[PDB]
Each structure stands twice: as C-alpha cells, then as structure tokens.
Amino acid sequence: SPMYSIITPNILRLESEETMVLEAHDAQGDVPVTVTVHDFPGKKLVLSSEKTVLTPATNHMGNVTFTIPANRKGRNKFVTVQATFGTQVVEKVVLVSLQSGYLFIQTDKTIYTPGSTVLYRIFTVNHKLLPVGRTVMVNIENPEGIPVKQDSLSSQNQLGVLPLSWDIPELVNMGQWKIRAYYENSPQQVFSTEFEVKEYVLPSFEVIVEPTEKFYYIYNEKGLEVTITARFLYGKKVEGTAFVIFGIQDGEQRISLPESLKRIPIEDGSGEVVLSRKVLLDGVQNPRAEDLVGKSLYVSATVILHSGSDMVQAERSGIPIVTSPYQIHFTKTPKYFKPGMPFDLMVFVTNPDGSPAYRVPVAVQGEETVQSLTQGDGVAKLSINTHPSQKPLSITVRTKKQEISEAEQATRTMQALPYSTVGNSNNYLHLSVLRTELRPGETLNVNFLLRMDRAHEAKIRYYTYLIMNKGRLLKAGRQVREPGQDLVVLPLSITTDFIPSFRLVAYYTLIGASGQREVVADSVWVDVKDSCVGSLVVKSGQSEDRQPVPGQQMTLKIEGDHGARVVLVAVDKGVFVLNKKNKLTQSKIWDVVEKADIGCTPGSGKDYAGVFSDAGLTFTSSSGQQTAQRAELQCPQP
Amino acid sequence: QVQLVETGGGLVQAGGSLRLSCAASGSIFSLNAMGWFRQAPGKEREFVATINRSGGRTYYADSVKGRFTISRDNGKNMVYLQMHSLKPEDTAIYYCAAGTGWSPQTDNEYNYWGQGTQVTVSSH
Amino acid sequence: EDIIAEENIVSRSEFPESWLWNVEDLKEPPKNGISTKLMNIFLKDSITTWEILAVSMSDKKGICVADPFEVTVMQDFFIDLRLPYSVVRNEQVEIRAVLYNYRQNQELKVRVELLHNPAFCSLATTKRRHQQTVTIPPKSSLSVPYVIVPLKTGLQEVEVKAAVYHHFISDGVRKSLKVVPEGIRMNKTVAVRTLDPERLGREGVQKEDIPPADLSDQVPDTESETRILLQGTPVAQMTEDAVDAERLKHLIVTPSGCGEENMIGMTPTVIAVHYLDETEQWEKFGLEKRQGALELIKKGYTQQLAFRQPSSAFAAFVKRAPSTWLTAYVVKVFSLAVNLIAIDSQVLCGAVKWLILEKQKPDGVFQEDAPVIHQEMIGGLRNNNEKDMALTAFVLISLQEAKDICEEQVNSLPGSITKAGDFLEANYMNLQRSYTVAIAGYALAQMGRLKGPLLNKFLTTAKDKNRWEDPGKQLYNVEATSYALLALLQLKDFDFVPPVVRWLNEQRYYGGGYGSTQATFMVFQALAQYQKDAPDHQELNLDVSLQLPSRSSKITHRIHWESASLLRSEETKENEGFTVTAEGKGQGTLSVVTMYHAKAKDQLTCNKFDLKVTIKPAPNKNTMILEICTRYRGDQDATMSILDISMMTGFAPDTDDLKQLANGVDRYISKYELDKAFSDRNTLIIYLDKVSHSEDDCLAFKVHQYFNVELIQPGAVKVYAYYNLEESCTRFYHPEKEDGKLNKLCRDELCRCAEENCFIQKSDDKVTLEERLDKACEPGVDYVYKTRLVKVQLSNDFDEYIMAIEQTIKSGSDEVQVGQQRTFISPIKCREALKLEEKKHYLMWGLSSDFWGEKPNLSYIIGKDTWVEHWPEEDECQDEENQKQCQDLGAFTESMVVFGCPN
Ligand SMILES: *[C@@H]1O[C@H](CO)[C@@H](O[C@@H]2O[C@H](CO)[C@@H](O[C@@H]3O[C@H](CO)[C@@H](O)[C@H](O)[C@@H]3O)[C@H](O)[C@H]2NC(C)=O)[C@H](O)[C@H]1NC(C)=O
Ligand SMILES: *[C@@H]1O[C@H](CO)[C@@H](O)[C@H](O)[C@H]1NC(C)=O
C-alpha cells in the first residue's frame, strides 16, 4: 500500500515563502496533490491553495511553496496544513510565529550631546537576510520610556534601507536612550538599540586596560597582572600618570577593592600594575579561595596627562576567576547515538572569556587512544565506536595540554541515549561527515550508512534528504540507492546559501518486519565558516605613502557586489573612547539569525519523530507515522 | 606628486635685470614653502630665496639680500624671482623647488625639484 | 617688529564627531563578481583617526557589514584647543591650548595668540592682542593657559592662532562651547486635565484650552520646552472564566444507533468542538484530538441521513412517523454544525420547509404528534405543564439558527416566525413555569420583541436574580438558565448576566450522561456565545486633535483600543497657549510639563573641596611664594587627589622647592616634571596620596619671574579626586587683582569686560580747541558735562566717583539737572591713572554705551571712550601754564552751549 508523506518546518512565518515537500512512497502512476492552508481552530479561511502532480518520472518527489498572509493576544496561533493526495487527506496542525523578518538599527555614533542630531538607519530584511518592502514603525524613547518621536515608513523600492534623523533638544534627559522598531504586520517582535546622551568633549587619547591573561587563575601567586596602554588617537605614545583600582564582581554586585588602588607612571605610553593575591583575599573578607571561583574581576584605570589638559577613564571587566584556562562544552554534540555505529563527538573548547581555543588536545577517558585537536573554530571531532546495545553512553572528555598540570585541566561529562527503533527491528541510518571549517565553493561528501537486516535491505532504493538553513527548507532531494549498496555518498555543493550553517536530515521508509510501516531517520548539524553571503571591503584608493593632512582630498576604494547600495559613515575614534556599545557588526547579525533558528539540537532524536522535530521539521503520513505536536516557540531549556 | 618647469632665463648684460617664472604641475596652494636655488659652475648649489604659502613671509641669502624679490601667485600656480642689479657672480643654473615649510633656507626639506634654467650674466 | 601670525592663518573649524553619512551604489561593471567604486572624499580638519564603517544591501546577496577602515590625520605642529563642553555665564575659567611639536630633533619657537571676542572677557581687547612667545622642545608639548570669562549665553566661539619662528609653519583652531546661564534645570507641571468627551464638554466634543507655561522663576531670555503627553487610559471589565477543558474530555462520543440514538451520540461531540473552538482551549487539551472528533461529527451527519425520510423529515426509523421535535432538533444541531463542517444545505432547509407546511397551524402553534421514542433527548419540554407554549418556543429557536442559511430556500420562513411570535406574546403573561418563560424568553428576544412587561416577567422570574428554577429534574433548570443566558446575550444586556453565569459555573455541570442531550447542548452553546460576545474593555476610541497657534497644522491622534499608540508625546519649543479638542468614547489623560532654567543659587562650584590660593611677594627679577591650602568636605579623608597648578604668565616654579615637595610622605611630583627645564614650564601637577577633611593641608613653593611681561595673566589651581573630574574646585591667583579675577563690571547677572583702556589717553597739551569740538560733536558722544568730584567711595572691585553735574554742556539721553549727582565707575587699576581729586572740576564726555543701571539709578562707566580732563579753577587760570587750557575750556563751553554742534 502507498504511504503519502508531507514535511514542513515546525514553525511557519508570515509573509515568508515556506516550502512543503510532498512524497508518494511505493506508488505507480501520477498522483495529483492539492495543498491547502487553513486557519485554526477553524477551517473557514483559505490562506493558500497550490496544486501539483507527483509524476513517476521524478520518483514521486515534488514541492509546493506557499506564503501565509499577514492579515493579523498573548498565546500561540496555529494553521491547518492539508495536502490531499488523490482522495487521501494528510493534514498536520503547525505552530506559527508572528515574525515578518529582522530589523537592524544603525546609529552614526554611540553617544550624543544635547543639541546634536541622531542620524540612524534601519535595515529591513526577511528571514533570508534579503531586503524587503514592508511598513515599519519606529520609536525614539527617553530613559523614562516616553516615546518622543514616532515614525511610520515604507521601505518599498528603498532597497531595505530607511534613513532617519532626530534633533536632540537642549532641555533633555541624560542616560540610555532607545530606538525601537517593529514591523506593522508583526508588532510583537520589537528590535531595539541604545545610544547614550551625555555632556562631553572628545578626548585626545585612548586608554587600553589589558591583563596579561584574559582570566585569573585562583592559585596564581603572582596575582592579576595588568598592562595600561595609552596613546593618542593619531598614533603617538602618551606620557602621564595612571590611577588603577581593582574590584570583584559576583553576578551583578560590584565590590571595589580600595587597598588595590595604585598610582603608576605611564612612561612611553605603557605602564604595569598588579592586583596581589593577598589584597584580593583580604578585600573580599578572607574566604576560602575556592569560593571566588566563578566570580569575575574588573579593572578601572584613569590616565592623566602630565600637563593635566586631558584625562581618560577606561575599564576592563569580566575577567573570570578560574581553576582551569579551558571550558569544555557538548552543545555541538548530538545527545543520541545509534548502537553498533560510530558516534562522532563534537567537543567545543573555549577560553574563559568565551572565545574558541586553538590547538587544545582533548581525549576521552577510559580510551587514551582516541585523542584529537581543536581547530580554529574551537571544535575537535572524536569518533568512538559504540556497542550494539541499548545501554546509555556516558562520555567524559578531558583536555591534555602539555604545559598544564593535571589540576588545571578541563573536564565535562555528557550522556547519549540509544536511538529507539520501530518494533526493536534494529534498523538504523547513520549520516557521517568530516568536521572541519567548511566554506562555500567546496563539495561535502555525505556518507549514507545503512545498518539493517539483510532480509529487507533490497526494499530500500532511495533516501530522502532535506536541508535546513536559517529555519527554512533550502533544498530537498533524493539519494538513489541500489540493492547491496550499504553506503552511498551524496556530493553536496556548498554554496553561499548555506551560510552560516545548515542541517541535513535524511530518512528511508519501508514495510519490513511484521508488515509494519517503518520510518528510519537521522540528522547532522554542519557548520560553515561565518562570513558575508556577498562581500564588502573599504580601503584606500591612493598610494598613501603619505600621511594625510587636515582638509586633504583622499580617494576611497569600495569593493562589493554589483547592484548593491553601500551606506557609509565616518566617526572620530574619540567617540568610542567614551562609549563603544551597540555597534552594528556582521557577527551580531549572525547572532540574531542563529537565535531565531527553529532547530534545537545538533543531532538525531530519540526516534524517527524526534529527528524531524529537533531539526525543526514536521512529518505526517497516511499510515499514521507522524511527529509530536510542537506548541512552544522557543527551544527546550537545559 | 608635482613637478616644475623653469622659464624666463637667458643671456643678459652685467648691470641689467630679468625675472624667472616657475610653472607648477598641480595646485601650488597648501604648499608652505616655495624656494629658488642656484648652482654656479664650479660651486655648490646654494640658497637664494623662499616665500611663504600666502606670500607674507620671505627669506633671502645675504649675497642677494637687497637685490632679488621673490613672489608667488597661488591662483595661477606660479612662482617668480625678479632679479635686479645683477652681478657677474650670479651666473648659475636657477632651480625652482617645492618644499614643506620646515627649514625653508635649506634644500633638505624640498622633495620636488625642477629642470632648472640658465641665467648667464656676462661681464661684457 | 615682526608679527609671525601675518601668515594669513585660516583657522581649522570643521571638527565633526561623525560625517560621511553618504549612500553609494556600485553600478560599475564587475570584475569576477566584484564592483570597485572609487570615491573622492575631503577629510575634515580634525587631527585624529577616523573609523569608516560601510554596510551594503543587495537584492541577491543580502546585508553585509564591512570591517572598519581607519584613516589617521596628523601634522608635525598643531594646536589642540582643550575646550570644555559648557561654561556658566560670567564665571571665570581657564582653557588649555595644547601645542604639539612632533619634530624629531628641532626645538620650536612659536608665537601664539588668543584672538579677541566681544562675547568673552580676556586680556585680548579691541586695541590689544594677547600674544606670547613659547618654546616647545622636540617630541614634546606645551599647554598654553588662557583665562576667559563668557559674557553672553549661547554657542560662543574661541579661536587660537599660532605660527612658528624661522619656519613657514602655521596653525589655527576655532572651536565653540555652550554658555549656559547660572540657573539649574527644573521642571514644573502646567496642567493635568482628564479627557472624557461623553461626560465633559457638549455635543460630543470636549475643548480644553491649555494656559502657557506659568513660570515665575525662569532666568530671563532662556529657552523652555513644553511637552504635551496625550495618553489613553485603558479600562477593563470582569468576565467569568471558561470551563476547564479537562472536565469536558468525556464529550467526545462515537455516534451510533438509529435516528434518535445517532443524535444522542452526535450532540456532545458537535457542542464540544463548538465550545472548544470558541474558547480556543485546544492547546491545553490536545491539538491532535481536534481532527479525530471532527471525523466523528462527519460520522454523525453521515449516519443521520440514513434515517432522513424522503419527505425531508426525521424519524427514529424509515418506517416511523415523523416528529416535530426531532425534526426541529436536527435543524438545531445541523445549523450549529455548519460553522465547522458542511456537506448539504438542502437537507437543513428541506427540514425547515417541512416544519412549516405540516406542523404550523395559522395560530402559530407547533404541536407534537410525539413519535419521539427517546424521552431522554426531550429535556425540559417533557413533563411540562404548559407543554404547548414551551414547544412553540423550541421550534421557533430552531428556525432562527437556520434562518440565515435558508432565507432564499424557504421564503415562507419569516411568516411562520411572525405567527409563532404572535402566539407567544399573548400567553407569555399567563405562564407559571420558569422553564417556559426561559425558553420562550430566548424565543422572543431572538430577533424579536418582548414587551416591557414581558421583559419584567422574564427578569423577575429569576429566583435570587441569578437562576431559573422550577420543581422537577435539575437538568430542566440547567437547560432553562442556559436559555435565559442566550436571551440576556441576545438583548445585549450585561448587568443581569454576571450572576447568571456564576450560577452556571457553580453548578459544575460538564455535560454528558443519560438524558443530557438538551442540557449538554444548551449549556455549552450559551457559554460559547458568552465567550464570543463579552465586554473585556469599555471600547476606547478617542479622536483627539490639538490645534496649536505655534504651527500651521493640527496634529491628531486616533487613540483606539489598539496598543500601537497608547501614548504619543508632542514637543513644542514655542511657549504659547494651545487648544486640545477631544471627542469619542472612552477616557484619557493629558499631561503638559514644561522644562526651563530656574534661577537659583549658582552654588555648584567647589562643592567637594575648600581651596585657598595666596600669592605673596615674600623675599631672579621677581620672586613670590605661591601657597595652596586645600581641605576635603567629606566625613572621612579623601583618596588620591590632583593639584593641577597653572603658572601666571612669565613665572616658573623653583626646581629645588619641587624636589623637596616630591620627597614628601603624602605627595608625589613625577620625575617627568622634575627633569623639565626651568623655562617652558607653565603647568605642573602635584599628586596627593590623601587630603585631610579635618584640617587644611598646605604646601608652598617659590616662583621666579624669568621673563618680564607687560600683562600678567592670573594663574590657576585646580583640585579634584582621581575618580571625579566634574567635582573640582578652581581658584585663581594674581598680584594686584582681587582674588585673581579679571576686571569686569557686573550688575544683575550681566557683566561687561573692563580690561580696555582706562580713558582716552590724549594729552592736555597735544589737544586743541578744534580737536575738542570735533571729538565732542560726534554723534557717538552722548553726554558732555562739567562736573565736580564730591566723594570717592573706594572699593576693591571698582572705585565709585560721585560727580555733581556743574554744567550740562551737551545733554544726552539721560535727563540730569544742574546740582544732581551721577556715579562714575572705573576699575581699581585706573585709580592711579585717573588721579581724581575731591572738590576738583573735570570736563567729561563719553558714549551712551557706557550707561549702566536703570534710568532712575543710572550709573556712568569710565571706559576707553570716556574723556576725563582736569578743569582748573577760575583763579588757577591766572598762571601762564593753565592759560592755554583755560582759553580752550572756556571757549569749548561757549561754542557748544550757545551754538551747538553743526552736523
Ligand atoms: C522546489 O522545487 C523547485 C522547482 O523544481 C526547485 O528549484 C529548482 O531546483 C533545480 C535544482 O534541482 C534548479 O536547476 C538548476 O538551476 C541552476 C540555476 O538556474 C542551473 O545552473 C542548473 O543547471 C540547474 O538547471 C532549478 O533552476 C530550480 N528552479 C527554480 C525555479 O528555483 C527547488 O530546489 C525545490 N526546493 C526544495 C527545498 O526542494
Ligand atoms: C523632572 O525632574 C526630575 C528631578 O531631576 C527628574 O528625575 C525627571 O526625569 C524630570 N522629568 C522631566 C520630564 O524633565
């Protein structure tokens, strides 16, 4: 008997083109499919209605692209996705998020005086980061939350760039002001940025407070050594005096250490100062030194020129107190394994400040024979063979740094649960792929390994793979299998549409052991090197063996994509000496995209249904095989 | 960059006069120092006269202190050197040079020089 | 002599914090997919590093943020004018013009000048320049202190020019600071008027005239901003909670049986989906279960058509006689089922077509032939005393649920409805059962009329004003109250509803069971309509438009219940009375607050330290002792503090004294400052490990005058702790000037500079009679008096010379009579220059710009344009020396008084 299956994302977006792949397993002849999208709990409205035919020439594999219109309290909204294959109806209630895209707000400066003008742009993109034409509501509110200016623009034919401005009055409050924007169609998703309003003048030099290490080892008798660096904005060393004081921060309580106040000279633009271990312990009321582990240290330096004509305050905070210079995370490793098949650990090692650590050897305890090295992304792959057993897999990974004693090593333990199969048939599907920094233009060889009984392997003749990128279905295809090919390689072309990462979920289906329809799936999360989809570079268009002079003409070179609209700004770096927060960067854009990802897990699930849901997909069939209902917009919290 | 072309030279008598015109390639504005230098046959290149960027300050060598007058036209990108009451010891190749303004009486702060022109003041 | 600043310096003025706010399009043909656009920009005058940020947006590539590109702009010699953000009006401050010399091994000799500005009081006047020559060692800088006093508020400008000796290098900086008045920012509430157009105002509109800002503490000639805050006031109404769907899980039934048994299983499933769809409790009940019950509803409609007789009627069997109640109940269930599932409408209208042809007497009565085998489904209609009127109301309600669906199919339906309504009104006031009045209370409220008395009998039959009850099974009374709720919700009455619904919820009846067909269907159709139509709010919709004479437009705001613009602020810098027109429904609040500069105590200077600075000529040309005493104003000793000492022009500290101070226990003078040369050392910082709060910590060192100067600018001392530069204290010191302050004349927070010349310096012998007449006959010369000095009131700020007007030679804009007195003011520096003696006579003239006070108390100022000449007495003229002057003065008077000034 034929089984009709449909797959959609777990969460559907408004005004966004979602993809719905339709399959007709074990069928002959043409299969007409009418896909309709209705509301919920009703069915009166027809939100979309597309038609297609699954021809046997395409092996009954086709898709239908729809778009939920944005006609629209505090609870979830759902829709009824319904595809009628011939006369068989296969429907699934799908959670819907009221998001129209993203909004990024750029201000010309990070800080402003009363009387000055705030020049700010708003970039209107969708979930694919492509520019869109939507109606955007914009607010500027004071520290008291009172919106002082409200706008309503149309980004249509604006290439997704809304330039705006506001004159700050002279009689005005000081503090943190907000620029808040949201789409008209999705007013529940608000994007914000801050800019400080303060009375100031630009300083003439900057101060850098740099500790010799980006953490403090609690058993380091040398204390926290810090180097104070001061130089003029135009690139000349500063002579003066520095007032440096230390403090400890537990959560959000800051405790200054008055005994740590040192007055050091700044000779040739540099000066050094130490927070001794005794002063730290005495200032925090002489506890056991292990109690300070987990807290952070902050450093505040005030440099004054010997002329006294200018002074600058700088602060370096968030210096964590640690017993080990490394942290081990299994946040990129699947939490489910397949008994009898190799399990690929994705050990992520970070420095105490969160940055990825390079060339840190890690190894699994109890083996001492499987030892890898972390790449530039901080990840090291550790493939370990697993017994064909239903036991839980407890894994403890430790660092093996040569210059580091065993006390200062890092450790972390994770547990992987066995993938549950239908009827205990022990039919699995393994997706293996090498883990190194993948970049567009390369080809990825995805290995489809099949562990199953040989009395039914001749029935599996194709795998159905789906690619999840940025919470949408990018490409869905078929990997043909011939009887006897327990392994087939899918060469996947990695283009710029796979940035910043993607999920590859595949599944095969058959009628095997007791005549029961069995669906076996697996997924893997593949990270690609973060960058722009296109490119943009600004550099000098002249020789510039000369240093430019005030008022001098300068040629600027801009290299980018054809037909792209480039917006510019030139800021005096003295502004950033006063405030450097809330600056738009490409890294912050990719942070917004990954936080909006509707996939919650880097690997497979407890069963075939868990594989689809964890990757952000729904599955529904006429044979009863389907995924569990998802009603929460956010991911489960560990 | 910028290069220079010297004109106005030639042959003259002992007592007379002549002015040398220096043509600039680019806009001479914002160039602090514009100086004239000469090199007599058998002698070294010596300093003659410098002029301010706006023309309000000048410096002359003691040998030609009250006999030469340097002037510039920033709008025409031109420098001039009016030579009066000539002496047979003034026979030299006259060079026009662009400077930075620093130490305008020495040649070590001039990075753009000209071809030069011959000014022969004969004792006959 | 040579003024090196003759270099025609055009000072640098463009110092933006951000620029290049441009938009470029990469239209050039791409090479390997990369378009390169060359762009000519003009760098600004700032000497710093610029960070250029570019962001691109592409139709096919998306958004991309480029890495920042830096451009450093520098010179070998330049001025850095360290100007504060703001300065208080008439307060004396010291700015710093820092001159930088980044030559590798060349020591510069620079001539630096502070340009005169009439908005400031400095050593630079209209006839005198503040020029000085300084020395800057290579790879070093020198801070040139300048003492100024701002005289007028607003954005005022300071310009400093410099030109180096023996090099053709010059520079100029022209920055601006804000001059703020002496007051403190303060906010006052102008008005708080509540908007309610349906309670205030007339004809539906409410006009509210706002008075302008009523400030009386404002500093004169200062800006005020009035903020208009329109904000809607949201209100909410209480509503009774919906029944928890966990108690309704048993209503999902697989319908089976014959024509009557199939409807018994179909009823709890259709009414459960209907109630759960309206309340949207499927999330807390199981979203997957919705489709399974939807198929059981289809299964019920499919198996009910098997017992639909060919006469479009309904009976228990295909051989059973049709029923008036069962046919009307299939119409009641199928009508409520259309909203979720539909197949055929002619089945619903076919039953209504039969329900009027066969079972409608022209009396309007529906009579039951009773083939209903199941008396369970009948409900309250069974065992009813007035079973004839209760059935007419039951069928009439069934026709209404299908009236909007069978209006064109059954065109005789409005006739039977009117006939059925006619029968109910007549015998409505004669019923004695609470069930009949309840079902026929919803049967006449539905798209019908219940008379005033009929409504009174419907409301008064509710025992305890919350429920409808009658002797009999409680499922009849629960069904009755459910009919009475659909009536109160059809009449749109909501004052009797809350106690009715509360009783239905306290009944804890969750449907299902034996004989529960009517009780389960009605209790969840009524409670669904209560959730369909319910007052959660009070419908806020205010159209408030403000007409301001400050502009030529009227700004309006539709304050819906929509949360997009609950509050909208409108700032108006103009302080004028405006009109607020507000109409619509709902309530709102209007808040009008005006910020302004309130005049108060100017005491914000030296709020954390006491600072006493004395300069004494205690005994290479000149040598004085600079003594500095400071004390912290806290409960404990202050931490590390700074003494930013500035030398008066021409003075430098004694090096041996600084080395002895650096050896102190609680003091630190950096090795950098001790190794500095004796000259070109006009600034110094003495660091203090602590400064006591109990006593004054005093240090003193000698200062020597290594360069004689005609004008000495007052030095300054500045104290502050390291963690707060804002909490500072600056005292000025200068010999021969009161407390180091520059000479100024102030009155009612308005000062004018007094560093100009004392008076017109022309000698009494170099002036002639014609020269006196030509000067005095100018229109600028307002007054010409002969005076007699009566009293000389000496003061430390300025000397007051009380003059008696002996003769009014030329009367000016001040009406002064002979014998009256006017005060002539001059700073104390002119006391030795004027040499005024009491009881002597003087010839005086001056400008009208030298008037000072108000007209009743008008004072004269002796400025650079005031003529002061000694007038010798009549007997004194007998000397040969005074003969020339007396012949001029006596002739000057006769020429001015008798003949005036021509032209
Ligand atoms: C949903 O179905 C659409 C339509 O079948 C898929 O788009 C099509 O994908 C094929 C690749 O399988 C594209 O063919 C290739 O196009 C490139 C670019 O033009 C060309 O260089 C190659 O030689 C080849 O012809 C095809 O153009 C493309 N068509 C459209 C209209 O986009 C899509 O991939 C399916 N999506 C999913 C998630 O399954
Ligand atoms: C009014 O003054 C108080 C006191 O400084 C301040 O907290 C508040 O923010 C001010 N509000 C406005 C609107 O200026």
Beta strands in A55-189 (DSSP E): 61-67, 77-85, 88-97, 102-107, 111-112, 117-125, 135-141, 147-154, 161-167, 175-183
Output the six-digit token pair for C507. Answer: 């009944």
Task: Please give the angle made by the CA atoms of A34, A618 and A518, to the nearest 5 degrees.
Answer: 95
Specify whether C170 is located in the same domain as C317.
no
Specify whether C1 is located in the same domain as C61.
yes
Q: Is A530 on the interface with C (CB under 8 A)?
A: no
Last residue of a domain, one of C740, C771, C796: C740
**DSSP line for A523-537:** EEEEEB----SS-EE
Q: Do C6 and B57 touch (CB under 8 A)?
A: yes
Contacts of A16 (CB under 8 A, 6+ apart): A67, A68, A99, A100, A101, A126, A127, A472
* Local structure of residue C742 (DSSP, 8 states): P
- What CA–CA distance (Å, rounded) separates C92 from C112? 21
Output the six-digit token pair for A485. Answer: 């090919």
Count Cβ atoms below 10 Å from residue C81 Cβ, excluding itself: 21
Task: Return the SS3 of C737.
Answer: coil
Chain centroid offset of residue A503 CA: 13
C26 in Cβ contact with C37 (< 8 Å): yes
- What CA–CA distance (Å, rounded) separates C374 from A77? 42
Residue C607 CA: distances (Å) to CA of A57, C148, C741, C819: 88, 22, 20, 50
**DSSP line for A455-512:** TTGGG--EEEEEEEETTEEEEEEEEE--TT-SEEEEEEE--GGG-SEEEEEEEEEEE-
Count Cβ atoms below 10 Å from residue C501 Cβ, excluding itself: 21
> How many CA atoms are closer than 13 Å to the CA of A616, on its beta-carbon side?
33
Output the six-digit token pair for A240. Answer: 């003066």
Nearest to C771 by CA among C663, C895, C651: C895
C114: domain CATH number?
2.60.40.10
> How many CA atoms are closer than 13 Å to the CA of C702, on its beta-carbon side?
16
Nearest to A507 by CA among A597, A601, A419, A385: A419
Burial class of residue A633 in the structure, from the number of CB atoms within 10 Å of its CB (0-12 exposed, 13-18 middle, 19+ buried): middle
- What CA–CA distance (Å, rounded) separates A375 from A363? 14
Contacts of A92 (CB under 8 A, 6+ apart): A6, A8, A81, A618, A620, A626
Task: Return the SS3 of C643.
Answer: strand
Residue type, C365: V
Tell me which residues of chain C, numbers 190 to 229, contact chain A at a CB-CB cutoff of 8 Å. 223-225, 229
- B95: which strand partners? B37
Backbone angles phi, psi at A59, to 5 degrees: 55, 35
Task: Please give the angle made by the CA atoms of B28, B29 and B35, to the nearest 5 degrees.
Answer: 55
Determine whether the shortest distance from the Cβ of C593 to ligand 2 is under 6 A. yes
Chain centroid offset of residue C638 CA: 37
C364 in Cβ contact with C423 (< 8 Å): yes
Specify whether C325 is located in the same domain as C455.
yes
Nearest to C120 by CA among C744, C827, C715: C744
A310 in Cβ contact with A294 (< 8 Å): no
Residue type, A348: F
- C230: which strand partners? C568, C590
A293 in Cβ contact with A218 (< 8 Å): yes
- What CA–CA distance (Å, rounded) separates C220 from A212? 57
Contacts of C898 (CB under 8 A, 6+ apart): none
Q: Find the closest chain C residue to B59 by CA distance.
A: C166
Determine whether the shortest distance from the Cβ of A476 to ligand 1 is under 6 A. yes
Specify whether C352 is located in the same domain as C462.
yes
Output the six-digit token pair for A193. Answer: 């940025």
C789: domain CATH number?
2.40.50.120
Output the six-digit token pair for C616. Answer: 């004494």
Task: Please give the angle made by the CA atoms of A294, A300 and A303, to the nearest 5 degrees.
Answer: 160
Q: Count the domains in chain C.
A: 6
By Cβ distance, the residue of A113, A548, A568 closest to C71 is A548
Specify whether C44 is located in the same domain as C159.
no
Output the six-digit token pair for C516. Answer: 């529960």
C842 in Cβ contact with C835 (< 8 Å): no
* Local structure of residue B46 (DSSP, 8 states): E
Output the six-digit token pair for A426. Answer: 């022990």
- What CA–CA distance (Å, rounded) separates C342 from C841? 119
Specify whether C353 is located in the same domain as C495.
yes
Peptide bond into A41 cis (omega under 30): yes
C859 in Cβ contact with C825 (< 8 Å): yes
**DSSP line for C790-854:** EEEE--SSEEEEEEEEEEEEE--SS---TT-EEEEEEEGGGHHHH---TT-EEEEEEEGGGB-S-
Peptide bond into A500 cis (omega under 30): yes
Closest approach of C71 to chain B, Cα-based (Å): 20
- Tokens 């010596």 label which residue? B46
Q: Count the domains in chain B.
A: 1
Nearest to C436 by CA among C385, C400, C485: C385
Residue C353 CA: distances (Å) to CA of A289, B53, C361, C443: 91, 108, 14, 20
Specify whether C620 is located in the same domain as C683.
yes
**DSSP line for C161-182:** EEEETTSS-EEEEEEEEEEE-S
Task: Return the SS3 of C518.
Answer: helix
Resolution of the experimental model, in Å, one decimal: 2.7
Chain centroid offset of residue C820 CA: 56
Q: Do B101 and C106 touch (CB under 8 A)?
A: no
Contacts of C795 (CB under 8 A, 6+ apart): C828
- What are the structural domains of chain A? 1-101+596-627 (2.60.40.1930), 102-202 (2.60.40.1930), 203-324 (2.60.40.1940), 325-426 (2.60.40.10), 427-531 (2.60.40.1930), 532-595 (6.20.50.160)
Residue type, A212: T
Task: Return the SS3 of C667.
Answer: strand
- Tokens 């020429």 label which residue? C895
C16: domain CATH number?
2.20.130.20
**What's the farthest any 2 CA atoms get from each other in chain B?**
43
- What CA–CA distance (Å, rounded) separates C720 from C688? 10
Output the six-digit token pair for C794. Answer: 């000496």
- What CA–CA distance (Å, rounded) separates C803 from C841? 9
Give 3-state DSSP helix, strand, coil % of chain B, rounded to 5: 5, 50, 45
C144 in Cβ contact with C98 (< 8 Å): yes
What are the helix and strand counts (H, E) for chain B?
Answer: 0, 11
- Tokens 């333990």 label which residue? A413
Contacts of C99 (CB under 8 A, 6+ apart): C77, C78, C79, C80, C110, C112, C134, C136, C141, C142, C143, C144, C162
Quote the ligand 2 centre to C187 CA distance (angstroms): 6
Residue-number span of the structural domain to which B1 is assigned: 1-124
Beta carbon pairs, A and C, within 8 Å:
363
Residue A99 CA: distances (Å) to CA of A137, A359, C445: 14, 41, 44
Specify whether C829 is located in the same domain as C860.
yes
Task: Please give the angle made by the CA atoms of A496, A501 and A503, to the nearest 5 degrees.
Answer: 115
Contacts of C742 (CB under 8 A, 6+ apart): C92, C121, C122, C123, C147, C149, C714, C753, C755
Residue B55 CA: distances (Å) to CA of A3, B32, B72, B111, C161: 95, 9, 7, 20, 18
Count Cβ atoms below 10 Å from residue B8 Cβ, excluding itself: 17
Residue A187 CA: distances (Å) to CA of A190, A191, A635, C568, C628: 7, 10, 22, 17, 63
Dihedral sign of CA atoms C25, C30, C33, C34 in order: negative
Which helix (H) or strand (E) element contains residue C282? none
Burial class of residue A61 in the structure, from the number of CB atoms within 10 Å of its CB (0-12 exposed, 13-18 middle, 19+ buried): middle
Nearest to A240 by CA among C173, C639, C683, C682: C683
Closest approach of C167 to chain A, Cα-based (Å): 18
Which helix (H) or strand (E) element contains residue C517? helix C517-532
Chain centroid offset of residue C435 CA: 62
Residue C717 CA: distances (Å) to CA of A308, A410, C209, C685: 11, 56, 55, 10
> How many CA atoms are closer than 13 Å to the CA of A139, on its beta-carbon side?
22
Residue-number span of the structural domain to which C774 is assigned: 741-903
Q: Is A171 on the interface with C (CB under 8 A)?
A: yes
Closest approach of C173 to chain B, Cα-based (Å): 17
b/e sequence A548-579, b meaning 16+ C-beta within 10 Å: bebeeebebebbbbbebbbbbbbbbbbbbbbb
C858 in Cβ contact with C814 (< 8 Å): yes
Set of chain A residues whose Cβ sits within 8 Å of the Cβ of C288: 93, 629
Specify whether C67 is located in the same domain as C88.
no
Q: Do B57 and C106 touch (CB under 8 A)?
A: no
Kindly list the strands in the beta sheet with C567-572, ordered across the sheet, starting from the edge strand earlier in the chain.
Answer: C184-195, C588-598, C225-232, C567-572
Q: Do B52 and C168 touch (CB under 8 A)?
A: yes
Kindly list the strands in the beta sheet with A46-54, ordered across the sheet, starting from the edge strand earlier in the chain.
Answer: A11-13, A88-97, A77-85, A31-38, A46-54
C231: domain CATH number?
2.60.120.1540
Nearest to A452 by CA among A400, A520, A395: A520
> How many CA atoms are closer than 13 Å to the CA of C156, on its beta-carbon side?
25
Residue C656 CA: distances (Å) to CA of A50, B1, C674, C701: 95, 53, 9, 9
Dihedral sign of CA atoms C419, C425, C430, C434 in order: positive
Q: Do A123 and C55 touch (CB under 8 A)?
A: yes
Nearest to C222 by CA among C598, C577, C750, C747: C598
Residue C20 CA: distances (Å) to CA of A544, A569, C13, C638: 20, 5, 17, 46
Contacts of C620 (CB under 8 A, 6+ apart): C704
Task: Return the SS3 of C399.
Answer: helix
What is the position in ligand 1's atom list of the atom closest to the CA of A475?
38
Output the six-digit token pair for A462. Answer: 């194709």
Count Cβ atoms below 10 Å from residue C269 Cβ, excluding itself: 23
Specify whether C442 is located in the same domain as C298.
yes
Last residue of a domain, one of C585, C604, C623: C604
Nearest to C461 by CA among C439, C433, C482, C488: C433
Nearest to C714 by CA among C692, C731, C696: C731
C646 in Cβ contact with C715 (< 8 Å): yes
Q: Do C64 and A560 touch (CB under 8 A)?
A: yes
**DSSP line for C469-501:** --SS-HHHHHHHHHHHHHHHHHTT--SSHHHHH
Contacts of A104 (CB under 8 A, 6+ apart): A122, A123, A125, A191, A584, A589, A592, C63
